[PDB]
């Protein structure tokens, strides 16, 4: 309920729910065991994943992807896409002739697991690289740090 | 029985095609009337169909049954087959041999002659003949099978024996560290 939006049934592919039991254990509770994995670089997998009820296959924690590659950081600008955000990375490109930098930026589309929330435009997000998720989406959000003005 | 085509333009007849005249066909390997230059290549060619008309250059005829009178060309003289059987079983067939008869004895020989050169008798090398060589190769490769089995047995026994000497020392380390 409320977890199943879509036409197809929404599962957690590696977990078998329908394991049968006594009618004494059916009255106790239904808690389908989460599959969550510890992602490797020392990001503690958020509390909101391991307890949480949502299902997203492309999330790094609760789903099937592996984080390997570059690890980048950026700031959140535009989130109107479902389970993805657009972050911008700024930097200084050095022009040799003039001996100075010019500003530049690049926009990355990057996927965001529904465990993180309250992720608010203009805050720092550290992402890590995944295998291609979509046409423009090659990355994945590993940890979210708030903007400098949080209360 | 009707067999071969040729037409005034020289094309063959391919038994499948149901037309009269030309048909352009894509021929692949295994088809009639094309032999491929390179592996797995197809050609488009011109093929005259399988229906017989006054249009044909030439018509090839097989003779299925001989009725009465003997024709000058096709009947009176009989031409032998050169090259009797090269395979063991084909020979056992020609001469009706039990498995226990020597094939070596019965093989047809070619009576080869030329003017100025000594008269020869040729014989083809028999293939699929049981023989000391063939029989040997068999027990050879079986012997290799014995070898492999032996090797897996000895290796298994060995690594099993080695695993225990690691295991009792892993038990010693764990137990001593724990009791401490």
């Amino acid at each position: 309920a409320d977890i199943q939006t879509e036409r197809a049934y929404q599962k957690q592919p590696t977990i078998f729910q329908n394991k049968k039991r006594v009618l004494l254990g059916e009255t106790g509770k239904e808690k389908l065991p989460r599959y969550y994995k510890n992602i490797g670089l020392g990001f503690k997998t958020p509390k909101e994943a391991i307890e949480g009820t949502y299902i997203d296959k492309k999330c790094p924690f609760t789903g099937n992807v592996s984080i390997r590659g570059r690890i980048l950081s950026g700031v959140v600008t535009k989130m109107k896409m479902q389970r993805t955000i657009v972050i911008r990375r700024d930097y200084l490109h050095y022009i040799r002739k003039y001996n100075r930098f010019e500003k530049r930026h690049k926009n990355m589309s990057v996927h965001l697991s529904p465990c993180f929330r309250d992720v608010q435009i203009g805050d720092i997000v550290t992402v890590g690289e995944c295998r291609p998720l979509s046409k423009t989406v090659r990355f994945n959000v590993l940890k979210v740090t708030k903007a400098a003005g949080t209360k | 029985r009707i067999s071969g085509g040729n037409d005034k333009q020289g094309f063959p007849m391919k038994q499948g095609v149901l037309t009269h005249g030309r048909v352009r066909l894509l021929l692949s390997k295994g088809h009639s009337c094309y032999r491929p230059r390179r592996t797995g290549e197809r050609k488009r060619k011109s093929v005259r169909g399988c229906i017989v008309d006054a249009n044909l250059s030439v018509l090839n005829l097989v003779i299925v049954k001989k009725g009465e009178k003997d024709i000058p060309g096709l009947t009176d003289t009989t031409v032998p087959r050169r090259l009797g059987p090269k395979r063991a079983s084909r020979i056992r067939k020609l001469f009706n041999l039990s498995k226990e008869d020597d094939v070596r004895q019965y093989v047809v020989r070619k009576p080869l002659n030329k003017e100025g050169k000594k008269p020869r008798t040729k014989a083809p090398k028999i293939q699929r003949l049981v023989t000391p060589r063939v029989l040997q190769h068999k027990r050879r490769r079986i012997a290799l099978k014995k070898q492999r089995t032996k090797k897996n047995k000895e290796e298994a026994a060995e690594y099993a024996k080695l695993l225990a000497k690691r295991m009792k020392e892993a038990r010693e380390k764990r137990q001593e560290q724990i009791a401490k």
Partner: protein, 62 residues
């Protein structure tokens, strides 16, 4: 009005003299009966066995 019949034609292997053995020799060896062939086989087999134990004695001699 229609044709319901599919003709079944037969293939026959005739006989021809093979160069070096004329049809008389082919038929001479073919029509040879079991007594004749069994005699020839056992005789050649025993001649070969004798030559072979002779060559085993000729292996141990050298």
């Amino acid at each position: 009005x229609x044709x319901x019949x599919x003709x079944x034609x037969x293939x026959x292997x005739x006989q021809r003299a093979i160069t070096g053995a004329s049809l008389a020799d082919i038929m001479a060896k073919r029509n040879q009966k079991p007594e004749v062939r069994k005699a020839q086989r056992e005789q050649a087999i025993r001649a070969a066995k004798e030559a072979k134990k002779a060559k085993q004695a000729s292996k141990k001699t050298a």
